[PDB]
Amino acid sequence: AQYEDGKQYTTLEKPVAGAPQVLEFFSFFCPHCYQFEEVLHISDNVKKKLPEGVKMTKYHVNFMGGDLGKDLTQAWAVAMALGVEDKVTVPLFEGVQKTQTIRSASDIRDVFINAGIKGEEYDAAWNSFVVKSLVAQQEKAAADVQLRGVPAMFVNGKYQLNPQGMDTSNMDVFVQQYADTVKYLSEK
Template identity: 55%
Template sequence: MKKYLLPLIGLLFTVSAQAATFTEGKEYISLEKPVPSAPAAVKFFSFYCPSCYQYDEVFKVTDNVEKVLPADVKLTEYHVDFLGPLGQDLTHAWSVALLLNVENKVKPLLFDAVQKQQTIKTTGDIRDLFIRAGVSASDYDAAWNSFAVKSLTAKQQDLAKAVDLQGVPAIFIKGKYMINPKGLNSDSVNAFVQNYAETVQFLISKP
């Protein structure tokens, strides 16, 4: 059964450059079937996932991961459609956000609307949120119905299958490795987030 990780409780932190050791099977897991076509760093999430909300909006795990990536590596974010009644529609809407380059504008609004306000009940509600974020109705409708967005949606779905995604949030590096949250330092949220980011940094530099 698809699942998401339990939310964390604690404080934020700033990534340090201290030395650390990393072990396959502990901090990260090597994929049995690597996916060479995958982005160098990709995160899967869902607006219906409480831990995804915590990672992004509360504990800033995603922000700290982005800080340790090389200048030429971007963290690609893909939405999954196996959670929630509008999971597929939100994945399609996320493709609209990617196409229109408004991810940073709509992501916090969608998280708030789904997780806190619980105001996303229909595809019309999703559309209204994009418009409130500054996207014109005509641009949204054109993107929603475009071949490019359909292709982006299929790309997200196909990669989730290719890496055998079992739950979110999840970060994969080079189509070879998956961060294993259960093996990270859980002494505090600070320690967890630091260990998470440092593991990403290690794997990005690993062949």
């Protein structure tokens, strides 16, 4: 076939019922995740090729960056709850990996402030139980699929993208193959 199990994707031995349609995992400490966001714009190009009626989910993970890794998962929960993902994603990535100016929760907080979220609003969110359960959601989803690496994308809780098996000669060609694979898997 043109799309083969173990080639552009793998299949989960243990499928996850009720899972989000398109589910993406990342870490702000994850170097290919930075690329996926800043250079390749994977999430965005997948969305452009997804059928409509399809919802897209992106979660942060704890297993990179120790204590700060967990702070960042809680911050991503804040970002999701306030709907400000598109204004903090870039500065968080650059704060962690480019400038290395993110070293504490207060530094994470600064990124949101500079992006225009009010201190009061940020801290209320940070401490809220809605964010607590949002953090739980992120963890559970990762636990459901035995996740030990990022970036990762799962389709309908039973297929996992396998970017290792796609040409990387051309970044643009890589992205389309990746998105076309999500679409193929989506329709499966």
